[PDB]
Design a protein around this nucleic acid. Structure first.
Lengths: 122, 175, 120, 114
RNA sequence: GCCAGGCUGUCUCCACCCGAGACUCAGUGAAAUUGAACUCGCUGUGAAGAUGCAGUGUACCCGCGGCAAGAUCUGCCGUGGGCGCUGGAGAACUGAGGGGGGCUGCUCCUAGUACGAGAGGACCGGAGUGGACGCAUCACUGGUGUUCGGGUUGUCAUGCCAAUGGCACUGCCCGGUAGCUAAAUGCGGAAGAGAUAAGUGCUGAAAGCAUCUAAGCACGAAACUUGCCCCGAGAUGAGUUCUCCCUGACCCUUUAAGGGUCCUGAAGGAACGUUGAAGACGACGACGUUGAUAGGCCGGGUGUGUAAGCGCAGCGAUGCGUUGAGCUAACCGGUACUAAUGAACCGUGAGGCUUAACCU
RNA sequence: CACAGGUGGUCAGGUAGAGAAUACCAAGGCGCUUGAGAGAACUCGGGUGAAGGAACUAGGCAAAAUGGUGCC
RNA sequence: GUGAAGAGGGAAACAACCCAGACCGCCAGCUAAGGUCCCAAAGUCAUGGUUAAGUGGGAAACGCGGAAGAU
RNA sequence: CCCGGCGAGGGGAGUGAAAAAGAACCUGAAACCGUGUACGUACAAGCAGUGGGAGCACGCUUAGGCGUGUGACUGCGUACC
């Protein structure tokens, strides 16, 4: 779960290090966004040269949540922190071909069939 | 159709073969024998009175003892009514088991919420008044497991009333 | 709130209440009889009965534990020697409470609390 | 009461070994992929044990890609297949929530040598 | 003067815990205001928003806790004492009426389907899955859990070491029993039904055409109401059903819904105790020896973590086997060991008059 | 008013402490003049807490984080 | 002309609208304004006409329409 | 003398014309506080009164419908300066 104005760890080779949330989407008058929800984040630090520039505003999706998510069998997946990967409204395919840390099994969505291939460590 | 009165015992999880954990609340359903029958000609409507449990003879009022003696059954801990669905009738002393819920797959639970003291305006409507000890019903619940020989009923979710409280389980009207 | 919770409030500091109960238990052991309020008497019984039950068994660890919650060497010595064998046959219910009306000072209910044997 | 105790105990399998907190352990988990099921091995260190009847669950932590991931495994759930202890540890602490900050040598623990 | 960063419930959302007030028991106890009050809502008028004027409607009398729309009063929610439902009493309900909400996105098959020259392209509202509200719950995710356990700095005390207890915010922290908790999980915005606007229609002229209508005469919007739950016979129009109890005597008078005396004291309730996941006080639930209602005890479980002592090693810190040991409040199954005694009080002794049908 | 307020100077121990500040004790003085009750909403003084440290507020106003020695 | 300094009855209430100037008492009769379905005292009285919309029981200019009025 | 606490206060006896004169001491009213007596009131809306008014108790001409105590209901009634 992620709230407004929360830092998300970067799990892609785009060069981003610190990203801040600005707006939350995925439901009218919604206060929190889950792991499988689209969020609006910005960039605080950028590499000297690359496709990502400071101040850009674009969509993103959380891959890991500090609070975690539950399972039908009662199991809970909890991570040491919140990790998010930037997404674009057009050309959803993220630039990063490598993702830090494992990922859960809830990424079977229609548009997330291309990310399960990455993240070899589960 | 017709509901039965049971006693809440607790709630836990049930593990499925596929590996899914489901909350289950446990209701002890004693044989709720029928004491009196109400009819259109005499009482103005069709209904049957159900009783359950046991009361000590000393702590049973003489009028209730006489009523149960007329019913030809031992005195229970309470009396409840259920409106018939215009189906087959019943007879006095006809014990009813949980088998009726063995093929419904959808039940509604009515009971008294746990009591609470005075509640503030924010605590009530987010004015102040008594909280709990009020009839409340939760509908569209599916039975998980039925054990007739053990008088055990497991129903998904949560139901009003803490341990030791009495509740009513009725066939789901909505479907 | 107020659901399945043990321990009457007895509005006071927690350490103050603990010291109060220590003094109550020590007095009851020393004199085998107390004349105190029922609300305090109930918790006095609840806190003192474990002490006598533990004292029924004699051991260095048991004596040290009894002294920890008693802080009176003479009272601890009184235990394990007279009360332990006196109530050895009995299991639980080592105290009895008898009401003696309401206190005249402030209409506060008061009662006597004493051991089952209390003598002999 | 008796009924709930019977219901809880009737679904208990005497196969989980007794593992102390902070002891390295491997867990076999059934995972559904496509229309089939397969096995997955998860190695980690047990941090907390909360054995509430059949609700018994233990937290296992692992370090992957430089990040710490902790998952709670249910002791008696069908999803968990078997529990095996590879490296034996010894810590005089029921809960190991303190190691979330430690790393490298500090996070390491000594052999039990019982 | 300004910038970058770390840093807390200021907030999404607040949740829990410790103390003094808030409520009751025994006593002391003043004020501001005060013409008198048997101190209702709406409509119209009025020196112009009427508790007091005309019309209309509702409301048993009197108390306790707050929400402050105007804390004395009006008003609202919850809950109490008295009273009547006509002999009394205990239970179960029909129900005149009353509380409220009927929200909303994505995907799936339908289906790249009908239609459509092609382009284009659904009705579907059937299934699954989100967002916000309410209700329910603590097994799960955790928070709290100063009443449980352990680490640790200073100081005092137990004659001293060891070992213990108090104080220093719970002395500072690490975990956590039960209860409560949302950030956790179960359900609901029904389906169907009635009347429906527009609109869609069988035969059809007057006025050999035509037309929703003149004659026969049919469907239908997410709009409205039932259907969904909850309170409800103080509904004084005071309801319906079941069961139980009383089956004595005598005297007087102003001779009748009369009065009085001895005996009787039924069912039930209240009175007091254990008390509760019931509670501010009331009230409510279970029990009161013919018992698991509270405490303690046995065993288990949870939690904490290898207690003290013993003997070995290091001349010391400390470790080793005893010892997965000791302790464990609120959890679970038993145990009368302790506390709920025998009792007293109210509540009565056949139930008012008239009418109509029955056996007499 | 036995009120919660002001009233001038002196006597100045031990422990850990740079310290007459800080915490417990020595001799000494006191538990302060209403007590007891289940411990509701609510008010006041505090403690902990998942996603955050400034997204409420005109406002970093309360609270909260560190609080030093020598060197690389 | 009224109130000021005049009551009473009617207009549902109402001080300037209509009748009407209270010496006091009486369980008497007759009238002014206003009424004679009730509330509430009086005709559900008679004759000749308008009304199908509760217009009566709120409305102008204008071609029955105009017409929308106060929890 | 007794109750009361070896108090305060009270109850008897006596003195005292009188103690309905007891040191709070001639005469002792209303505001205010209590008991008893008779009546009305717990389905009933507003300056709380005025006429009608059955009923509820007492004494009277021993009925002859009289007065006192209350006023269910009813027409009217928007305080003083």
């Amino acid at each position: 779960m992620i709230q407004e104005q929360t830092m998300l760890n970067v799990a892609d080779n785009s060069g981003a290090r610190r990203v801040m949330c600005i707006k939350v989407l995925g439901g009218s008058h919604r206060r929190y966004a889950g792991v499988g929800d689209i969020i609006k984040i910005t960039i605080k630090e950028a590499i000297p040269r690359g496709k990502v520039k400071k101040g850009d505003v674009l969509k993103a999706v959380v891959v890991r949540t500090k609070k975690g998510v539950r399972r039908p069998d009662g199991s809970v997946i909890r991570f040491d922190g919140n990790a998010c990967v930037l997404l674009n409204n057009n050309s959803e395919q993220p630039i990063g071909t490598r993702i830090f840390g494992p990922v859960t099994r809830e990424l079977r969505s229609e548009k997330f069939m291309k990310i399960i291939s990455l993240a070899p460590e589960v | 159709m017709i509901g039965l009165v049971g006693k809440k015992v607790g709630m836990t999880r049930i593990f499925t073969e596929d590996g899914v954990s489901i909350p289950v609340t446990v209701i002890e359903v004693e044989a709720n024998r029928v004491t009196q029958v109400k009819d259109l000609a005499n009482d103005g409507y069709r209904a049957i009175q159900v009783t359950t449990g046991a009361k000590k003879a000393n702590r049973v009022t003489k009028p209730e003892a006489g009523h149960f003696a007329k019913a030809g059954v031992e005195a229970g801990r309470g009396l409840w009514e259920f409106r018939l669905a215009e189906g087959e009738e019943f007879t006095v002393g006809q014990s009813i088991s949980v088998e009726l819920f063995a093929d419904v797959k959808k039940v509604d639970v009515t009971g008294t919420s746990k009591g609470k003291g005075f509640a503030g305006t924010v605590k009530r409507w987010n004015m102040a008044g008594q909280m709990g000890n009020e009839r409340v019903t939760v509908q569209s619940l599916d039975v998980v497991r039925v054990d007739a020989e053990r008088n055990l009923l497991l129903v998904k979710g949560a139901v009003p009333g803490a341990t030791g409280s009495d509740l009513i389980v009725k066939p789901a009207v909505k479907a | 709130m107020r659901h399945r919770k043990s321990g009457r409030q007895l509005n006071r500091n927690s350490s103050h209440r603990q010291a109060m109960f220590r003094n109550m238990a020590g007095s009851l052991v020393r004199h085998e009889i107390i004349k105190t309020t029922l609300p305090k008497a109930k918790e006095l019984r609840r806190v003192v009965e474990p002490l006598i039950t533990l004292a029924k068994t004699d051991s260095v660890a048991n004596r040290r534990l009894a002294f920890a919650r008693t802080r009176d060497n003479e009272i601890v010595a009184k235990l394990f020697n007279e009360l332990g064998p006196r109530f050895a046959s009995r299991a639980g219910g080592y105290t009895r409470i008898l009401k003696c009306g309401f206190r005249a000072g402030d209409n506060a209910p008061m009662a006597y609390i004493e051991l089952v044997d209390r003598s002999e | 009461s008796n009924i709930i105790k019977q219901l809880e105990q009737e679904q208990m399998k005497q196969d989980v070994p007794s593992f102390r907190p902070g002891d390295t352990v491997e867990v076999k988990v059934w995972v559904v992929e496509g229309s089939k099921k397969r096995l997955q091995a998860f190695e980690g260190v047990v941090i907390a044990i909360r054995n509430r009847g059949l609700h018994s669950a233990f937290t296992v932590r692992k370090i992957s890609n430089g990040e710490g991931v902790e998952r709670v495994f249910q002791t008696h759930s069908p999803v968990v297949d078997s529990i095996s202890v590879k490296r034996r540890g010894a810590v005089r602490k029921a809960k190991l929530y303190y190691l979330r900050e430690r790393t490298g040598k500090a996070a390491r623990i000594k052999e039990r040598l019982n």
